[model samples]
Target: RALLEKVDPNKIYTIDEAAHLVKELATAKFDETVEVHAKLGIDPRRSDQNVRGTVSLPHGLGKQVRVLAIAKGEKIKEAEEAGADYVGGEEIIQKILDGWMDFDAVVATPDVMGAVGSKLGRILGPRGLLPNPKAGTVGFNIGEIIREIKAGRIEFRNDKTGAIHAPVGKASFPPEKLADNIRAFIRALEAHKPEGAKGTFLRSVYVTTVMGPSVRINPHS
Candidate 1:
């Protein structure tokens, strides 16, 4: 409660108001690093099961992400060509089964998913890298998708109570970098709003650092 009070509620801005707010906030000295996160209670894949897409950030995530691509036969070469850090098929599943998770993201062809799914289900599922349909990490074009995943593409998921959390940008990033990524994510969410969402689809948005205080951001204004 005390932490929440420190947040400047007036600084919260929605998609429409965010541009101007960001412009204004750019002048302020934000000494601590802040991470922008979008919180959504609705799932975009609820409406269309056929939706397969990707959104790339203009500025790459600040941290280095390791990519693991599961592909077999020719797909192995494809994933390798796409610059995957680690490329394998059954071996990947064995690694996962052995409790090894060295990569941050996982990209797999639909065919390979069937084999790897069972093994990684318990492991990656809890870690939010199970490569669900909504995230577009599971697809046929393993190589193409792997390239995108390596190039700043990310996946976010909701918790048990249904709240989606995504890192829009890092505090180390320039204000413009954070603003650009936040705008891109908002546009994506607007484009993919679910139909069954009751009441408010997006509950709220908060920005904070690893140990810093949370700053409330307006979800809709």
Candidate 2:
């Protein structure tokens, strides 16, 4: 925490500068992640204004996010062929029920979800693993979604405070690449502006590493 003194908490910087400083400030040997925290002006309590979706970053997240596909028969083969870390049916649900959770993201065939929907809800919902139609995680188009994720698709949504924070890229990534990811993420949110929103859609934005001091951003930029 003491290292934060190196950055001025009150000064805001351009997206490119923040991206570069994030890497320069990071000292880890392993690539550090760059995160974005955006505060939207709309009220999240309104069903129409709650924002959520999947975005494909230009650069895939620096981590190998393990994906699990909950499907049966041919879908299982399709998921595995596309590089899912795990794929199965009832046996997979059974493993999760027995507390064998060991994956990052999850996708389930619609038919498959009907059988295990309520079963996995107990553990998966809170963990954000419950497949949703919004994230393109609930359906038979399993392979396409899996491929997108492996290629850099990220899922995000607003929290209770009307603020959303998500991984943009790695500190090791070139600043230009990270800045592009930030812009892409913002564009995704702006593209989904709700019909009921009445005022400024976005209020403020910030970029930081997992442990770095926050850097303000001009949302317009």
CA RMSD of all predictions: 8.4, 6.5
lDDT of 2 by residue, 1-221 (tens): 57777677787778888887787787664455577888897887887888887676876542387888888888888998888888887678888888776776778888888767778776675444678765567789898878877877777888888988777876777889999998888888888788878788877889866545789986666
**lDDT string, candidate 1, 162-192, tens digits:** 4444546444456666767776665555555
What lDDT score belongs to each candidate, Candidate 1 first? 0.60, 0.77
Q: What is the C-alpha RMSD, rounded to one decimal, of candidate 1?
A: 8.4
Where does the lowest 10-residue lDDT sum fall in candidate 2?
54-63
What TM-score does candidate 2 get on C-alpha atoms?
Answer: 0.65
Highest TM-score: give the candidate number.
2
Candidate 2, residue 98: the lDDT equals: 89
Residue 214, model 2: lDDT of: 87
Model 2, stretches more than 4 Å misplaced?
61-79, 85-145
TM-score of each: 0.53, 0.65
Count of backbone collisions within predicted model 2: 0
